[PDB]
């Protein structure tokens, strides 16, 4: 619904889609080979299927192909600094593909805006939709253009005739959040039955280890999902089903 969305946001005003209460198959996205870029930080595109997460956020927008490379941790540039940035501590996936048959036309598809001018650089997940005329020089702009005064948001003239670097690309960035909270999202992973009083390997909603899964009376508060030993290791779980 995001990747094949018919409409993407202007990058200066990139959209954020909340994905929750679902099964997340990422192997179907990765191996579709529809993407030119599918760069996952920390955890590979097909391994993150083993992680559940409580929330997944899909940041959806259109940029020029030459700016796709700026959507990464530690980067600078007109998109990384003024339209859409990623944090150094990014463990998500940057997925991008050519949309030269969707977001471009002869004469130019100007539906997508981006920021050139900003008083300061963006925080990793900041969005900035101000229409104030940027003052580059010494003369107050007072809302209008003039010498060293220029409206900060311009369209990308996306045309099918552009070389690849200026063809439009659709970019979706997937941020995956692991909280103390129970998962609402799991990968395409089948469950089995519980076994007690035997040594087993286990996986409880993404929590793994080896031990004997006996039943107990630990008085977990209604909202607690896991317990702890004197060693501060997990010594109990609540079964996710």
């Amino acid at each position: 619904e995001v990747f094949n969305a018919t409409r993407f946001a202007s990058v200066y005003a990139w959209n954020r889609k909340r994905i929750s209460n679902c099964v997340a198959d990422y192997s179907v996205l990765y191996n579709s080979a529809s993407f030119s870029t599918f760069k996952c930080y920390g955890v590979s595109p097909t391994k993150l299927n083993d992680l559940c997460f409580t929330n997944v956020y899909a940041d959806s927008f259109v940029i020029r192909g030459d700016e796709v490379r700026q959507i990464a941790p530690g980067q600078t540039g007109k998109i990384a600094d003024y339209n859409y940035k990623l944090p150094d501590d990014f463990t998500g996936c940057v997925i991008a593909w050519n949309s030269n048959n969707l977001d471009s036309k002869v004469g130019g598809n100007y539906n997508y805006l981006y920021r050139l001018f900003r008083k300061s650089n963006l925080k990793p997940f900041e969005r900035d939709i101000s229409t104030e005329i940027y003052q580059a020089g010494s003369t107050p702009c007072n809302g209008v253009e003039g010498f060293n005064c220029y409206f900060p948001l311009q369209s990308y003239g996306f045309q099918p005739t552009n070389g690849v670097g200026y063809q439009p690309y659709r970019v979706v960035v997937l941020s995956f959040e692991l909280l103390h909270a129970p998962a609402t999202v799991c990968g395409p992973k089948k469950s089995t039955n519980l076994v007690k009083n035997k040594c087993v390997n286990f996986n409880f909603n993404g929590l793994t280890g080896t031990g004997v899964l006996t039943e107990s009376n630990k008085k977990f508060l209604p909202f607690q999902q896991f317990g702890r030993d004197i060693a501060d290791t997990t010594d109990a779980v609540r079964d996710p089903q």
Epitope: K78, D81, Y82, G108, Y110, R115, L116, F117, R118, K119, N121, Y134, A136, G137, F147, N148, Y150, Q154, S155, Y156, G157, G163, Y166
Partner: nanobody, 122 residues
Framework: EVQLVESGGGLVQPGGSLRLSCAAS??????????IGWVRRAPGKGEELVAR????????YYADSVKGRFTISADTSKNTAYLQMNSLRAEDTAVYYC?????????????WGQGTLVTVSS
Amino acid sequence: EVQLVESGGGLVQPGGSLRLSCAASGFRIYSYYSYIGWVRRAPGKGEELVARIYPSSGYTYYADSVKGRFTISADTSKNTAYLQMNSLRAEDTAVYYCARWDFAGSSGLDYWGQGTLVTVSS
């Protein structure tokens, strides 16, 4: 190497029109989001901004004093900026100059052409 090269000044009858042309030499306009506009200096005045074209964004912006009369355009194959000045009056006599603003996070007009005189008189 990198410079703004212009010509096209001359004498024009009021109510008529004159077109100026400024070539981008050593760089391209469209492919680098470089913006080329025009500035004029009427006798008795300092620099007045006239218009700017951004072929890469498909936009033209104008100063209030020329809106409705002047059109700024560009040829991205010829890599040339043009100013089409319609309905010229004696008050529009000025030396017209082309100038370069690159996309940005500040910017400004750092590159300038030589200027050419546009005389509007009957």
